[PDB]
């Protein structure tokens, strides 16, 4: 049914293909939805992520402010390409959200739409390979006030091998600084710059969570309820092997 990219019992994914793979960034700064304010600072996240993913070997494509049908179209075409010579696929989305919802320029769609077309049955050439998703967007409007601490052939599931990283926990707000970008993307890019080549993905995202959890705290003196709030990312993994990028 599909080509075997690595032997059955390997502890690591085979990241020694000709290409690292495609990295698609859907960056959303402005919206044709009256209730949505501009996301000043997202271009800093976009530039920063694009730069680090290039050093890691990704062929990066940034899609600025697409309508929902546009995102869906490019996603399908990507799922339709031949990924035989790529180690993996990375999709990133920087935008506004609600629980179970992401916003395009014109309207909203379900986050599941991003990875739906990449299951092994729909995209055989990435079968057995890691499919990465990073989402910077709110998953609701709840706030985390934080707390102070003192003193020959083998078969696999078509849903295996997905890593889905949300900037925040379901139901919660996600924070963005207008001059430095989002907390999640600042921490993600910094950890990728420091150990992106040598550390496994889960360990790396564990430290990305630490950074977001410890080094950030909201400052909004004009709105007490939004002030001094905290945040922790939510990493969802279906990875069946360890992921270490290595150097191409």
């Amino acid at each position: 049914v599909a080509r075997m990219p690595v032997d059955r019992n390997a502890p690591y994914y085979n990241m020694n293909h000709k290409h690292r793979g495609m990295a698609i960034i859907f960056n959303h700064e402005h919206f044709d939805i009256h209730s949505l304010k501009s996301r000043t600072g997202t271009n800093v996240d976009s530039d920063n992520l694009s730069k680090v993913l290039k050093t890691l070997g990704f062929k990066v494509t940034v899609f600025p402010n697409l309508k929902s049908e546009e995102i869906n179209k490019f996603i399908q075409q990507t799922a339709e390409m031949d990924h035989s010579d790529a180690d993996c696929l990375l999709v990133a989305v920087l935008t506004h959200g609600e629980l179970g919802m992401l916003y395009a320029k014109d309207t909203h769609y379900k986050p599941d739409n991003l990875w739906y077309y990449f299951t092994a049955d729909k995209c055989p050439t990435l079968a057995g390979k890691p499919k990465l998703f990073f989402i910077q967007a709110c998953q609701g409007d709840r706030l985390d006030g934080g707390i102070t601490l003192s003193r020959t052939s083998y078969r696999i599931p078509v849903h295996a091998d997905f890593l889905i990283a949300f900037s925040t926990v379901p139901g919660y707000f996600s924070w963005r600084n207008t001059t430095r970008g989002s907390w999640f993307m600042q921490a993600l890019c910094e950890e990728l710059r420091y150990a992106g080549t040598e550390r496994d993905i889960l360990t790396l995202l564990t430290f990305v969570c630490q950074k977001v959890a410890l080094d950030f705290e909201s400052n909004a003196p004009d709105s007490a309820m939004m002030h001094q709030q905290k945040q922790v990312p939510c990493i969802t993994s279906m990875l069946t092997r360890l992921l270490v990028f290595g150097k191409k």
């Binding site: 304010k37 996301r39 000043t40 600072g41 935008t95 506004h96 959200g97 910077q136 967007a137 709110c138 409007d141 900037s167 707000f173 996600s174 924070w175 963005r176 600084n177 207008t178 989002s182 909201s218 400052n219 909004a220 939004m226």
Partner: peptide
């Protein structure tokens, strides 16, 4: 600081 703002929310998404």
């Amino acid at each position: 600081d703002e929310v998404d």
